[PDB]
Coordinates of N, CA and C in Angstrom, one line a residue:
Chain A
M1 N 2.7 36.4 10.8 CA 3.6 35.4 10.1 C 2.8 34.7 9.0
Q2 N 3.5 34.0 8.1 CA 2.9 33.3 7.0 C 3.1 31.8 7.1
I3 N 2.1 31.0 6.9 CA 2.2 29.6 6.8 C 1.9 29.1 5.4
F4 N 2.3 27.9 5.1 CA 2.2 27.3 3.7 C 1.3 26.1 3.8
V5 N 0.2 26.2 3.1 CA -0.9 25.2 3.1 C -0.8 24.5 1.7
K6 N -0.5 23.2 1.7 CA -0.4 22.4 0.5 C -1.5 21.3 0.5
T7 N -2.3 21.3 -0.6 CA -3.2 20.3 -0.8 C -2.6 19.0 -1.2
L8 N -3.3 17.9 -1.0 CA -2.7 16.6 -1.5 C -3.0 16.4 -3.0
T9 N -3.5 17.4 -3.7 CA -3.6 17.4 -5.2 C -2.6 18.3 -5.8
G10 N -1.7 19.0 -5.0 CA -0.6 19.7 -5.5 C -0.7 21.2 -5.5
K11 N -1.7 21.8 -4.9 CA -1.8 23.2 -4.8 C -1.2 23.7 -3.5
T12 N -0.4 24.7 -3.6 CA 0.2 25.4 -2.4 C -0.3 26.8 -2.2
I13 N -0.7 27.0 -1.0 CA -1.4 28.3 -0.7 C -0.7 29.0 0.5
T14 N -0.3 30.2 0.3 CA 0.4 31.0 1.4 C -0.7 31.9 2.1
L15 N -0.7 31.8 3.4 CA -1.7 32.5 4.2 C -1.0 33.5 5.2
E16 N -1.7 34.5 5.6 CA -1.3 35.4 6.6 C -2.0 35.2 7.9
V17 N -1.3 34.8 8.9 CA -1.8 34.4 10.2 C -0.9 35.0 11.3
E18 N -1.3 34.6 12.6 CA -0.5 34.9 13.7 C -0.7 33.8 14.8
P19 N 0.2 33.8 15.8 CA 0.1 32.7 16.7 C -1.2 32.6 17.5
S20 N -1.9 33.7 17.7 CA -3.1 33.8 18.4 C -4.3 33.3 17.6
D21 N -4.1 33.1 16.2 CA -5.2 32.7 15.4 C -5.5 31.2 15.6
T22 N -6.8 30.9 15.7 CA -7.2 29.5 15.9 C -7.1 28.8 14.6
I23 N -7.4 27.5 14.6 CA -7.5 26.7 13.4 C -8.7 27.1 12.6
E24 N -9.8 27.5 13.3 CA -10.9 28.0 12.6 C -10.6 29.4 11.9
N25 N -9.6 30.0 12.4 CA -9.3 31.3 11.7 C -8.7 31.1 10.3
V26 N -7.7 30.2 10.3 CA -7.0 29.9 9.0 C -8.0 29.2 8.0
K27 N -8.9 28.4 8.5 CA -9.9 27.9 7.6 C -10.8 29.0 7.0
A28 N -11.1 30.0 7.7 CA -11.9 31.1 7.1 C -11.0 31.9 6.1
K29 N -9.7 31.9 6.3 CA -8.8 32.6 5.4 C -8.6 31.8 4.1
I30 N -8.5 30.4 4.2 CA -8.4 29.6 3.0 C -9.7 29.7 2.2
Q31 N -10.8 29.9 2.9 CA -12.1 30.1 2.1 C -12.0 31.4 1.2
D32 N -11.2 32.4 1.6 CA -11.0 33.5 0.8 C -10.2 33.1 -0.5
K33 N -9.0 32.5 -0.2 CA -8.1 32.3 -1.3 C -8.6 31.3 -2.3
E34 N -9.3 30.3 -1.9 CA -9.7 29.2 -2.7 C -11.2 28.9 -2.7
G35 N -12.0 29.4 -1.8 CA -13.5 29.2 -1.8 C -13.9 27.9 -1.1
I36 N -13.1 27.2 -0.3 CA -13.5 26.0 0.4 C -14.2 26.5 1.7
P37 N -15.4 26.1 1.9 CA -16.1 26.5 3.1 C -15.4 25.9 4.3
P38 N -15.4 26.5 5.5 CA -14.7 26.1 6.7 C -15.2 24.7 7.1
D39 N -16.5 24.4 7.1 CA -17.0 23.1 7.5 C -16.5 21.9 6.7
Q40 N -15.8 22.2 5.5 CA -15.4 21.1 4.7 C -13.9 21.1 4.6
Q41 N -13.2 21.7 5.5 CA -11.7 21.7 5.6 C -11.2 20.9 6.7
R42 N -10.1 20.2 6.5 CA -9.3 19.6 7.6 C -7.8 19.9 7.4
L43 N -7.2 20.4 8.4 CA -5.8 20.9 8.3 C -4.9 19.8 9.1
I44 N -3.8 19.5 8.4 CA -2.9 18.5 8.9 C -1.5 19.1 9.2
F45 N -1.0 18.8 10.4 CA 0.4 19.1 10.7 C 1.0 18.0 11.5
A46 N 2.2 17.5 11.1 CA 2.9 16.4 11.7 C 2.0 15.2 11.7
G47 N 1.3 14.9 10.6 CA 0.5 13.7 10.5 C -0.7 13.6 11.3
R48 N -1.1 14.7 11.9 CA -2.3 14.7 12.8 C -3.2 15.9 12.4
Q49 N -4.5 15.6 12.5 CA -5.5 16.6 12.2 C -5.6 17.7 13.3
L50 N -5.7 18.9 12.9 CA -5.7 20.0 13.8 C -7.1 20.4 14.2
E51 N -7.3 20.8 15.4 CA -8.6 21.0 16.0 C -9.0 22.5 16.0
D52 N -10.3 22.7 15.7 CA -10.8 24.1 15.7 C -10.9 24.6 17.2
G53 N -10.2 25.7 17.4 CA -10.1 26.2 18.8 C -8.7 26.4 19.3
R54 N -7.9 25.3 19.1 CA -6.5 25.4 19.4 C -5.7 26.3 18.4
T55 N -4.7 27.0 19.0 CA -4.0 27.9 18.1 C -2.8 27.3 17.5
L56 N -2.2 28.1 16.5 CA -1.0 27.6 15.9 C 0.2 27.5 16.8
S57 N 0.4 28.4 17.7 CA 1.4 28.3 18.7 C 1.1 27.1 19.6
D58 N -0.1 26.7 19.8 CA -0.5 25.6 20.6 C 0.0 24.3 19.9
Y59 N 0.1 24.2 18.6 CA 0.6 23.1 17.9 C 2.0 23.2 17.5
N60 N 2.7 24.2 18.0 CA 4.1 24.4 17.7 C 4.4 24.6 16.3
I61 N 3.5 25.3 15.6 CA 3.6 25.6 14.2 C 4.4 27.0 14.1
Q62 N 5.6 26.9 13.7 CA 6.5 28.0 13.6 C 6.4 28.7 12.2
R63 N 7.1 29.8 12.0 CA 7.0 30.5 10.7 C 7.6 29.6 9.6
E64 N 7.0 29.7 8.4 CA 7.4 29.0 7.2 C 7.1 27.5 7.3
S65 N 6.3 27.1 8.3 CA 5.9 25.7 8.4 C 4.8 25.3 7.4
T66 N 4.8 24.0 7.0 CA 3.9 23.5 6.0 C 2.7 22.8 6.6
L67 N 1.5 23.2 6.2 CA 0.3 22.5 6.6 C -0.3 21.7 5.4
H68 N -1.0 20.7 5.7 CA -1.7 19.9 4.6 C -3.2 20.1 4.8
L69 N -3.9 20.1 3.6 CA -5.3 20.4 3.6 C -6.1 19.3 2.8
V70 N -7.1 18.7 3.4 CA -8.0 17.8 2.7 C -9.4 18.3 2.8
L71 N -10.2 17.8 1.9 CA -11.6 18.1 1.9 C -12.4 17.0 2.7
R72 N -13.4 17.5 3.3 CA -14.4 16.7 4.1 C -15.7 16.9 3.4
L73 N -16.1 16.0 2.5 CA -17.3 16.1 1.7 C -18.3 15.0 2.0
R74 N -19.3 15.3 2.8 CA -20.4 14.3 3.0 C -21.1 14.1 1.7
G75 N -21.3 12.8 1.3 CA -21.8 12.5 0.0 C -20.7 12.6 -1.0
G76 N -19.4 12.8 -0.6 CA -18.3 12.9 -1.5 C -17.2 12.0 -1.1
Chain B
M1 N -6.6 -7.2 -4.8 CA -5.8 -6.3 -5.5 C -4.9 -5.5 -4.5
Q2 N -3.8 -4.9 -4.9 CA -2.8 -4.3 -4.1 C -3.0 -2.8 -4.2
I3 N -3.2 -2.1 -3.1 CA -3.2 -0.7 -3.0 C -2.0 -0.2 -2.1
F4 N -1.7 1.0 -2.2 CA -0.7 1.7 -1.3 C -1.3 2.6 -0.3
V5 N -0.9 2.6 0.9 CA -1.3 3.5 2.0 C -0.1 4.3 2.5
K6 N -0.1 5.6 2.3 CA 1.0 6.4 2.7 C 0.6 7.4 3.8
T7 N 1.4 7.5 4.8 CA 1.3 8.6 5.8 C 1.9 9.9 5.2
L8 N 1.6 11.0 5.9 CA 2.3 12.2 5.6 C 3.6 12.4 6.4
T9 N 3.9 11.4 7.3 CA 5.1 11.4 8.1 C 6.2 10.6 7.4
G10 N 5.9 9.8 6.4 CA 6.9 9.0 5.7 C 6.6 7.6 5.3
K11 N 5.9 6.9 6.2 CA 5.8 5.4 6.0 C 4.9 5.1 4.8
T12 N 5.2 4.1 4.0 CA 4.4 3.6 2.9 C 4.1 2.2 3.2
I13 N 2.8 1.8 3.1 CA 2.3 0.5 3.5 C 1.6 -0.1 2.3
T14 N 1.8 -1.3 2.0 CA 1.1 -2.1 1.0 C 0.0 -2.9 1.6
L15 N -1.1 -3.0 0.9 CA -2.3 -3.8 1.4 C -2.9 -4.6 0.4
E16 N -3.4 -5.7 0.8 CA -4.2 -6.6 -0.1 C -5.7 -6.5 0.2
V17 N -6.4 -5.9 -0.8 CA -7.8 -5.5 -0.6 C -8.5 -6.0 -1.8
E18 N -9.9 -5.9 -1.8 CA -10.8 -6.2 -2.9 C -11.6 -4.9 -3.2
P19 N -12.1 -4.8 -4.4 CA -12.9 -3.6 -4.8 C -14.2 -3.5 -3.9
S20 N -14.7 -4.5 -3.4 CA -15.9 -4.5 -2.5 C -15.6 -4.3 -1.1
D21 N -14.3 -4.2 -0.7 CA -13.9 -3.9 0.7 C -14.4 -2.5 1.1
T22 N -15.0 -2.4 2.2 CA -15.5 -1.1 2.7 C -14.3 -0.4 3.3
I23 N -14.5 0.9 3.6 CA -13.4 1.8 4.1 C -13.1 1.3 5.6
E24 N -14.1 0.9 6.3 CA -13.8 0.4 7.7 C -13.1 -0.9 7.6
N25 N -13.3 -1.7 6.6 CA -12.5 -3.0 6.5 C -11.1 -2.7 6.2
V26 N -10.8 -1.7 5.4 CA -9.4 -1.2 5.1 C -8.8 -0.7 6.4
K27 N -9.6 0.0 7.2 CA -9.1 0.5 8.5 C -8.7 -0.7 9.5
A28 N -9.5 -1.7 9.5 CA -9.2 -2.9 10.3 C -8.0 -3.6 9.8
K29 N -7.8 -3.6 8.4 CA -6.6 -4.2 7.9 C -5.4 -3.3 8.3
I30 N -5.5 -2.0 8.3 CA -4.4 -1.1 8.7 C -4.1 -1.3 10.2
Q31 N -5.1 -1.4 11.1 CA -4.9 -1.7 12.5 C -4.2 -3.0 12.6
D32 N -4.4 -4.0 11.8 CA -3.7 -5.3 11.9 C -2.3 -5.1 11.6
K33 N -2.0 -4.4 10.5 CA -0.6 -4.2 10.1 C 0.2 -3.2 10.9
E34 N -0.5 -2.1 11.3 CA 0.2 -1.0 11.9 C -0.1 -0.9 13.4
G35 N -1.2 -1.3 13.9 CA -1.5 -1.2 15.4 C -2.3 0.1 15.6
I36 N -2.6 1.0 14.6 CA -3.3 2.2 14.8 C -4.8 1.8 15.0
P37 N -5.5 2.1 16.0 CA -6.9 1.8 16.2 C -7.7 2.5 15.1
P38 N -8.7 1.9 14.5 CA -9.5 2.6 13.4 C -10.2 3.9 13.9
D39 N -10.3 4.0 15.2 CA -10.9 5.3 15.8 C -10.1 6.5 15.3
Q40 N -8.8 6.4 15.2 CA -7.9 7.5 14.9 C -7.4 7.6 13.5
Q41 N -8.0 6.8 12.6 CA -7.6 6.7 11.2 C -8.5 7.6 10.3
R42 N -7.9 8.3 9.4 CA -8.6 9.1 8.4 C -8.0 8.7 7.0
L43 N -8.7 8.0 6.2 CA -8.2 7.6 4.8 C -8.6 8.7 3.8
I44 N -7.6 9.0 2.9 CA -7.7 10.1 2.0 C -7.5 9.5 0.6
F45 N -8.3 9.9 -0.4 CA -8.1 9.6 -1.8 C -8.5 10.8 -2.6
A46 N -7.7 11.1 -3.7 CA -8.0 12.2 -4.6 C -8.2 13.5 -3.8
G47 N -7.6 13.7 -2.7 CA -7.6 14.9 -1.9 C -8.7 15.1 -1.0
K48 N -9.6 14.1 -0.8 CA -10.7 14.2 0.1 C -10.7 13.0 1.1
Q49 N -11.4 13.2 2.2 CA -11.5 12.2 3.2 C -12.5 11.1 2.7
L50 N -12.2 9.9 3.0 CA -13.1 8.8 2.6 C -14.1 8.4 3.8
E51 N -15.3 8.1 3.4 CA -16.4 7.9 4.4 C -16.4 6.4 4.7
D52 N -16.8 6.2 6.0 CA -17.1 4.8 6.3 C -18.4 4.4 5.8
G53 N -18.6 3.1 5.4 CA -19.7 2.5 4.8 C -19.6 2.5 3.3
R54 N -18.7 3.3 2.6 CA -18.5 3.2 1.2 C -17.4 2.1 0.9
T55 N -17.3 1.7 -0.3 CA -16.3 0.7 -0.7 C -15.2 1.4 -1.5
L56 N -14.2 0.6 -1.8 CA -13.1 1.2 -2.6 C -13.5 1.4 -4.0
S57 N -14.4 0.5 -4.6 CA -14.9 0.8 -5.9 C -15.8 2.0 -6.0
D58 N -16.4 2.4 -4.9 CA -17.3 3.5 -4.8 C -16.5 4.8 -5.1
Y59 N -15.2 4.9 -4.7 CA -14.4 6.0 -5.0 C -13.5 5.8 -6.2
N60 N -13.7 4.7 -6.9 CA -12.9 4.3 -8.1 C -11.4 4.1 -7.7
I61 N -11.3 3.4 -6.5 CA -9.9 3.0 -6.1 C -9.6 1.6 -6.7
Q62 N -8.6 1.6 -7.4 CA -8.2 0.4 -8.2 C -6.9 -0.2 -7.8
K63 N -6.3 -1.0 -8.7 CA -5.0 -1.6 -8.4 C -3.9 -0.6 -8.4
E64 N -3.1 -0.7 -7.3 CA -1.9 0.2 -7.1 C -2.4 1.7 -6.9
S65 N -3.6 1.9 -6.4 CA -4.0 3.2 -5.9 C -3.3 3.6 -4.6
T66 N -3.2 4.9 -4.4 CA -2.5 5.4 -3.2 C -3.5 6.1 -2.4
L67 N -3.8 5.5 -1.2 CA -4.6 6.2 -0.2 C -3.6 6.9 0.8
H68 N -4.1 7.9 1.5 CA -3.3 8.6 2.5 C -3.9 8.5 3.8
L69 N -3.1 8.3 4.8 CA -3.6 8.1 6.2 C -3.1 9.2 7.1
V70 N -4.0 9.9 7.8 CA -3.7 10.8 8.8 C -4.4 10.5 10.2
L71 N -3.8 10.9 11.2 CA -4.4 10.7 12.6 C -5.4 11.8 13.0
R72 N -6.5 11.4 13.6 CA -7.5 12.4 14.0 C -7.4 12.6 15.5
Chain C
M1 N 22.0 -35.1 -14.3 CA 21.1 -36.0 -13.6 C 19.6 -35.6 -13.9
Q2 N 18.7 -36.5 -13.6 CA 17.3 -36.3 -13.8 C 16.6 -35.9 -12.5
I3 N 15.7 -34.9 -12.6 CA 14.7 -34.7 -11.6 C 13.3 -34.6 -12.2
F4 N 12.3 -34.8 -11.3 CA 10.9 -34.8 -11.8 C 10.2 -33.7 -11.1
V5 N 9.7 -32.8 -11.9 CA 8.8 -31.7 -11.5 C 7.4 -32.0 -11.7
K6 N 6.6 -32.3 -10.7 CA 5.2 -32.7 -10.8 C 4.3 -31.5 -10.4
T7 N 3.2 -31.4 -11.1 CA 2.2 -30.4 -10.7 C 1.1 -31.1 -9.8
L8 N 0.3 -30.2 -9.3 CA -0.8 -30.7 -8.4 C -1.9 -31.3 -9.2
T9 N -1.8 -31.4 -10.5 CA -2.8 -32.1 -11.4 C -2.2 -33.4 -12.0
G10 N -1.0 -33.8 -11.5 CA -0.4 -35.0 -11.9 C 0.6 -34.9 -13.1
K11 N 0.7 -33.7 -13.7 CA 1.6 -33.6 -14.9 C 3.1 -33.6 -14.3
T12 N 3.8 -34.5 -14.8 CA 5.2 -34.7 -14.4 C 6.1 -34.2 -15.5
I13 N 7.0 -33.3 -15.2 CA 8.0 -32.8 -16.1 C 9.4 -33.3 -15.8
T14 N 9.9 -34.1 -16.6 CA 11.2 -34.7 -16.5 C 12.3 -33.8 -17.0
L15 N 13.2 -33.4 -16.1 CA 14.2 -32.4 -16.5 C 15.6 -33.0 -16.3
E16 N 16.5 -32.7 -17.3 CA 17.9 -33.1 -17.2 C 18.7 -31.9 -16.7
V17 N 19.2 -32.0 -15.4 CA 19.8 -30.9 -14.7 C 21.1 -31.4 -14.2
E18 N 21.8 -30.5 -13.5 CA 23.0 -30.6 -12.8 C 22.9 -30.1 -11.4
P19 N 23.7 -30.8 -10.4 CA 23.7 -30.3 -9.0 C 24.0 -28.8 -8.9
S20 N 24.9 -28.3 -9.7 CA 25.2 -26.9 -9.6 C 24.2 -26.0 -10.3
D21 N 23.2 -26.5 -10.9 CA 22.2 -25.7 -11.6 C 21.4 -24.9 -10.5
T22 N 21.2 -23.6 -10.8 CA 20.5 -22.8 -9.9 C 19.0 -23.0 -10.1
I23 N 18.1 -22.5 -9.1 CA 16.7 -22.7 -9.2 C 16.1 -21.8 -10.4
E24 N 16.8 -20.7 -10.7 CA 16.4 -20.0 -11.9 C 16.6 -20.7 -13.2
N25 N 17.7 -21.5 -13.2 CA 18.0 -22.3 -14.4 C 17.0 -23.4 -14.5
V26 N 16.6 -24.0 -13.4 CA 15.5 -25.0 -13.5 C 14.2 -24.4 -14.0
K27 N 13.9 -23.2 -13.5 CA 12.7 -22.5 -14.0 C 12.7 -22.2 -15.5
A28 N 13.9 -21.8 -15.9 CA 14.1 -21.6 -17.4 C 14.0 -22.9 -18.2
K29 N 14.5 -24.0 -17.6 CA 14.3 -25.3 -18.2 C 12.9 -25.6 -18.3
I30 N 12.1 -25.4 -17.2 CA 10.6 -25.7 -17.3 C 10.0 -24.8 -18.3
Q31 N 10.4 -23.5 -18.5 CA 9.8 -22.6 -19.5 C 10.1 -23.2 -20.9
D32 N 11.3 -23.7 -21.1 CA 11.6 -24.3 -22.4 C 10.7 -25.5 -22.7
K33 N 10.6 -26.4 -21.8 CA 9.9 -27.7 -22.0 C 8.4 -27.5 -22.1
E34 N 7.9 -26.6 -21.3 CA 6.4 -26.4 -21.2 C 5.9 -25.1 -21.5
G35 N 6.6 -24.0 -21.4 CA 6.1 -22.7 -21.7 C 5.7 -21.9 -20.5
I36 N 5.7 -22.5 -19.3 CA 5.3 -21.7 -18.1 C 6.4 -20.7 -17.8
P37 N 6.0 -19.4 -17.7 CA 7.1 -18.4 -17.5 C 7.6 -18.5 -16.1
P38 N 8.8 -18.1 -15.8 CA 9.5 -18.4 -14.5 C 8.8 -17.6 -13.4
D39 N 8.4 -16.4 -13.6 CA 7.7 -15.6 -12.5 C 6.4 -16.3 -12.1
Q40 N 5.9 -17.2 -12.9 CA 4.6 -17.9 -12.6 C 4.9 -19.3 -11.9
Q41 N 6.2 -19.6 -11.6 CA 6.6 -20.8 -11.0 C 7.0 -20.7 -9.6
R42 N 6.3 -21.4 -8.7 CA 6.8 -21.7 -7.4 C 7.2 -23.1 -7.3
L43 N 8.5 -23.3 -6.9 CA 9.1 -24.7 -6.9 C 9.2 -25.1 -5.5
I44 N 8.7 -26.3 -5.2 CA 8.7 -26.9 -3.8 C 9.5 -28.2 -3.8
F45 N 10.4 -28.3 -2.8 CA 11.1 -29.6 -2.5 C 11.1 -29.9 -1.1
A46 N 10.7 -31.1 -0.7 CA 10.5 -31.6 0.7 C 9.6 -30.6 1.5
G47 N 8.6 -30.1 0.8 CA 7.6 -29.2 1.5 C 8.0 -27.8 1.7
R48 N 9.2 -27.3 1.2 CA 9.6 -25.9 1.3 C 9.8 -25.3 0.0
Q49 N 9.6 -24.0 -0.2 CA 9.8 -23.3 -1.4 C 11.2 -23.0 -1.7
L50 N 11.6 -23.2 -2.9 CA 13.0 -23.0 -3.3 C 13.3 -21.6 -3.8
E51 N 14.4 -21.1 -3.3 CA 14.9 -19.7 -3.6 C 15.7 -19.6 -4.9
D52 N 15.5 -18.5 -5.6 CA 16.1 -18.4 -6.9 C 17.6 -18.4 -6.9
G53 N 18.2 -17.9 -5.9 CA 19.6 -17.8 -5.8 C 20.4 -19.0 -5.4
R54 N 19.6 -20.1 -5.0 CA 20.2 -21.3 -4.5 C 20.4 -22.3 -5.7
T55 N 21.3 -23.2 -5.5 CA 21.4 -24.3 -6.5 C 20.7 -25.6 -6.0
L56 N 20.6 -26.6 -6.9 CA 19.9 -27.8 -6.5 C 20.6 -28.5 -5.4
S57 N 22.0 -28.6 -5.5 CA 22.8 -29.3 -4.5 C 22.6 -28.6 -3.1
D58 N 22.3 -27.3 -3.2 CA 22.1 -26.5 -1.9 C 20.9 -27.1 -1.1
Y59 N 19.9 -27.7 -1.8 CA 18.8 -28.3 -1.1 C 18.9 -29.8 -1.0
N60 N 20.1 -30.4 -1.2 CA 20.3 -31.8 -1.2 C 19.4 -32.5 -2.2
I61 N 19.2 -31.8 -3.4 CA 18.4 -32.4 -4.5 C 19.3 -33.3 -5.3
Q62 N 19.2 -34.6 -5.1 CA 20.1 -35.5 -5.8 C 19.4 -36.0 -7.1
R63 N 19.9 -36.9 -7.8 CA 19.2 -37.5 -8.9 C 18.0 -38.3 -8.5
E64 N 17.1 -38.4 -9.5 CA 15.8 -39.0 -9.3 C 14.9 -38.3 -8.2
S65 N 15.3 -37.1 -7.9 CA 14.5 -36.3 -7.0 C 13.2 -35.8 -7.6
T66 N 12.2 -35.7 -6.8 CA 10.9 -35.2 -7.3 C 10.6 -33.8 -6.6
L67 N 10.4 -32.8 -7.5 CA 10.0 -31.5 -7.1 C 8.6 -31.3 -7.5
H68 N 8.0 -30.3 -6.8 CA 6.6 -29.9 -7.0 C 6.5 -28.5 -7.6
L69 N 5.6 -28.3 -8.5 CA 5.4 -27.0 -9.2 C 4.0 -26.5 -8.8
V70 N 4.0 -25.3 -8.2 CA 2.7 -24.5 -7.9 C 2.8 -23.3 -8.7
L71 N 1.7 -22.9 -9.3 CA 1.6 -21.8 -10.3 C 1.4 -20.5 -9.5
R72 N 2.2 -19.5 -9.8 CA 2.0 -18.1 -9.3 C 1.1 -17.4 -10.3
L73 N -0.2 -17.4 -9.9 CA -1.2 -16.9 -10.8 C -1.6 -15.4 -10.6
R74 N -0.7 -14.7 -9.9 CA -0.9 -13.3 -9.7 C -0.1 -12.5 -10.8
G75 N -0.9 -11.9 -11.7 CA -0.3 -11.2 -12.8 C 0.2 -9.8 -12.5
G76 N -0.5 -8.7 -12.9 CA -0.1 -7.4 -12.7 C -1.2 -6.4 -13.1

């Protein structure tokens, strides 16, 4: 299935994932589409930050759901 | 000065701050107005997480700037 | 009738008003006599702030009444 990742700066990114994929999995896929390293990504759904390890089905993220993406830059 | 704090769930909050206010000071002001403990607050400006120990002027946050708040 | 709008620095503004005059009208009268814009005016009577939509008679402001003027120094 496909999820929609929208940055708070206005960029929308469509990704290819599956319910068994962890949050660390989608972070590695965003690194492909946009080049953001996984250690500097934070994914938001329902106003809460998503944890590396728990899956998309674990957070009740269904098909065509919207995720939010922020940067975590130390020194930034 | 007056800044705006928006959640991604809908609520918009107005805050009275100073340029020399630190990020943790803004979080304590958010806890006062909202009840959210600063432990679970993440402030966002220009698309990136804001660090504790920095000030609002350090990120060039000025009058009527919009910060975003997400729960950790 | 006459009312007296005094500042916290002793400046007394004598205004010729009517009991049916609204607080906005009083502020516009102050702006004419002195030049203080209305949005910069906080008007106090009997220790409480006066609302724009009310009239003078609404606050039992009779003749020879003394009002107090505090400046709203917050610009934009």
